[PDB]
């Protein structure tokens, strides 16, 4: 069972320029000290990307934002996230997000990472939650409201248990994680990279190379996708359910892919130092 939470404010979105970033290894061959021209799906240099916040403030007027809207897929997705703690967990992919067609689910819940391909019925506002206890001084976690009906599952993968922090700090962001999602043939392909930063606002300008992470044989039809977040809940947020909660501090950026031609420059070990577009 799940509920709708309604104490949100209102504001239109924003746009931010992406600099020379978003390049990945396009095949499996190894080269060194070459200039190679490639044709593939890439993200254009100096292109609009869309900005999404999750920040709560009090004292001056009223400003509570918690955004996770349904967005189209088109040909592929480039995803970037900036956080001080762990606030983004995972994603739901599908074509109708109802009980008449299949869907894909990737979730982290502080003990195991779960990858499923199954028939579901997601409800309007999926979210995960935590609790802060004063007697313990411990950040214990108990909340999971993402679906209400799952059946006929085909693939299932549950991973090795691990530990993770859920504390939640204040200040400047100190992590950056980038993902690339592509769906081709009957295969789902995921690339990833991580880097440290010390910014306060907006996307860094630089260069990085992405490496392959996961290839899954699934065979679903994908047209839309949605994001899952985590929210806090403690003694300082009174009221009742659907009206008592607070947000953390996180942001993410999304962009799309197009057919382009690039001129990549390999190094003398096999690292892409820079690149140029036309």
């Amino acid at each position, epitope marked *: 069972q799940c509920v709708n939470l309604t104490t949100r404010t209102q504001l239109p979105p924003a746009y931010t320029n992406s600099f020379t970033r978003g390049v990945y290894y396009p095949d499996k061959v190894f080269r060194s000290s070459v200039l190679h021209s490639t044709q593939d799906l890439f993200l254009p240099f100096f292109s609009n990307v869309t900005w999404f916040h999750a920040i709560h403030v009090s004292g001056t007027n009223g400003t509570k934002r918690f955004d996770n809207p349904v967005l189209p897929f088109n040909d592929g997705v480039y995803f970037a996230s900036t956080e001080k703690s762990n606030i983004i967990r995972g994603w739901i992919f599908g074509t109708t997000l109802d009980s008449k067609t299949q869907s894909l689910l990737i979730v982290n819940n502080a003990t195991n990472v779960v990858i499923k391909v199954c028939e579901f019925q997601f409800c309007n506002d999926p979210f995960l939650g935590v609790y802060y206890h004063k007697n313990n001084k411990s950040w214990m976690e108990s909340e999971f409201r993402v679906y209400s009906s799952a059946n006929n599952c085909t693939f299932e993968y549950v991973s090795q248990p691990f530990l993770m*922090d859920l504390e939640g700090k204040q200040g400047n962001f100190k992590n950056l994680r980038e993902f690339v999602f592509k769906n081709i043939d009957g295969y789902f392909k995921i690339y990833s990279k991580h880097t440290p930063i010390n910014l306060v606002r907006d996307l860094p300008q630089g260069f990085s190379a992405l490496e392959p992470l996961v290839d899954l044989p699934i065979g679903i039809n994908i047209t839309r996708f949605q994001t899952l977040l985590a929210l806090h809940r403690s003694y300082l947020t009174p009221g009742d359910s659907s009206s008592g909660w607070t947000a953390g501090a996180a942001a993410y950026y999304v962009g799309y892919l197009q057919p382009r031609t690039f001129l990549l420059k390999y190094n003398e070990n096999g690292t892409i130092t820079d690149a140029v577009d036309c």
Partner: T-cell receptor
Amino acid sequence: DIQMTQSPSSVSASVGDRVTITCRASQGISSWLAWYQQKPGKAPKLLIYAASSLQSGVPSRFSGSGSGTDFTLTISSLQPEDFATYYCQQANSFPLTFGGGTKVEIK
Amino acid sequence: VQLQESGPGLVKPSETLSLTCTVSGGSISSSSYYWGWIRQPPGKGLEWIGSIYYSGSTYYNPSLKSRVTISVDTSKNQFSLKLSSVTAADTAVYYCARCRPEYYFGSGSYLDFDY
């Protein structure tokens, strides 16, 4: 409260042969385990993680299978540099526990 | 990446055992990983004594839990393990460790040791 027993001890082998070690659990761990090798006078180095995999550039003459309450390790052939003690460890609960170890020597 | 444990030599009965682990090649702060200590007595046997995380959240082995503490000095890349009281059977060889990181998301270490 997880207890293990390692049944072989002080196995003797020649240069080309096949040797096998079994590490038994007591609880119902599910396909999570680790194997370790200790050359004399050094610190242990990891060889196999999870049920069946390999990290880094360990030679591919090392491979083991898995189950829910039994486990094993076998090597295809020996070289004069394979002479040490091997260990098995769990990766499930908070009280981490280690095995008694088994010794492999070349004859 | 690279470690070099350090500490004293001969000790006295029922005293505090000092120790220090100077991490080299890695920022002890610019990480989200765990660190730990491991013991091996002469002869046969291995035991895990404690694991720590920077900025609090300490854990301890259920056996021999009364007299063990672990601290981290975030100013440098150093952490230490303290035993208030020792016995005649506490002599061994001690090792630092690093917990292997997570693969899909980052920000997490498994319950296994490498490096």
